[PDB]
Amino acid sequence: LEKRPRLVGGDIPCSGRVEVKHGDTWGSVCDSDFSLEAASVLCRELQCGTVVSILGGAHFGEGNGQIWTEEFQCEGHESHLSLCPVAPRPEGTCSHSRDVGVVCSV
């Protein structure tokens, strides 16, 4: 399950707050750290098609625990977030009020 995505707090299927498994935590992702490329990989990986909207600012609620401290530097084509290049991030630059969300289609 490591670096697998889920979407939680969404009203309809294939939408919600982004959470990506990191050890024993389903970690949220700061909107600032996210990208259309990573959102594309997430929608693909979740069998949810393509990105329609990226919503920042904890639109679908706030996560809890460790916010991701690596950035998913996806090229955009990858089948899995686990296959994207990553970069280390400094801790504490975002709160959960910036947890990113995605709406996928198909």
Author numbering: 1 to 4, 478 to 578, 1001
What does the paper say about this structure?
Infection by its etiological agent, PRRS virus (PRRSV), shows a highly restricted tropism of host cells and has been demonstrated to be mediated by an essential scavenger receptor (SR) CD163. CD163 fifth SR cysteine-rich domain (SRCR5) is further proven to play a crucial role during viral infection. In the current study, we prepared recombinant monkey CD163 (moCD163) SRCR5 and human CD163-like homolog (hCD163L1) SRCR8, and determined their crystal structures. After comparison with the previously reported crystal structure of porcine CD163 (pCD163) SRCR5, these structures showed almost identical structural folds but significantly different surface electrostatic potentials.
In this work, we prepared recombinant moCD163 SRCR5 in Pichia pastoris X-33 and hCD163L1 SRCR8 in Drosophila melanogaster Schneider 2 (S2) cells, respectively. Their crystal structures were determined and refined to 1.58 Å in P1 space group and 2.0 Å in C2 space group, respectively. MoCD163 SRCR5 was comprised of two antiparallel β-sheets (β1-4, β7 and β5-6) and three helices (a single α-helix α2 and two 310-helices α1, α3), whereas hCD163L1 SRCR8 contained two antiparallel β-sheets (β1-4, β7 and β5-6) and two helices (a single α-helix α1 and a 310-helix α2). A close comparison of moCD163 SRCR5 or hCD163L1 SRCR8 with pCD163 SRCR5 revealed that they shared almost identical structural folds (RMSD = 0.355 Å for 79 matching Cα atoms between moCD163 SRCR5 and pCD163 SRCR5, RMSD = 0.249 Å for 95 matching Cα atoms between hCD163L1 SRCR8 and pCD163 SRCR5). The minor differences between moCD163 SRCR5 and pCD163 SRCR5 were only observed in the long loop regions. MoCD163 SRCR5 displayed a similar surface electrostatic potential as pCD163 SRCR5 did, so-called “D/E-R-rich” charge distribution. The comparison provided a structural basis to explain why stable expression of moCD163 rendered comparable infectivity to PRRSV as pCD163 did, since their crucial SRCR5 shared the overall conformations and surface electrostatic potentials.
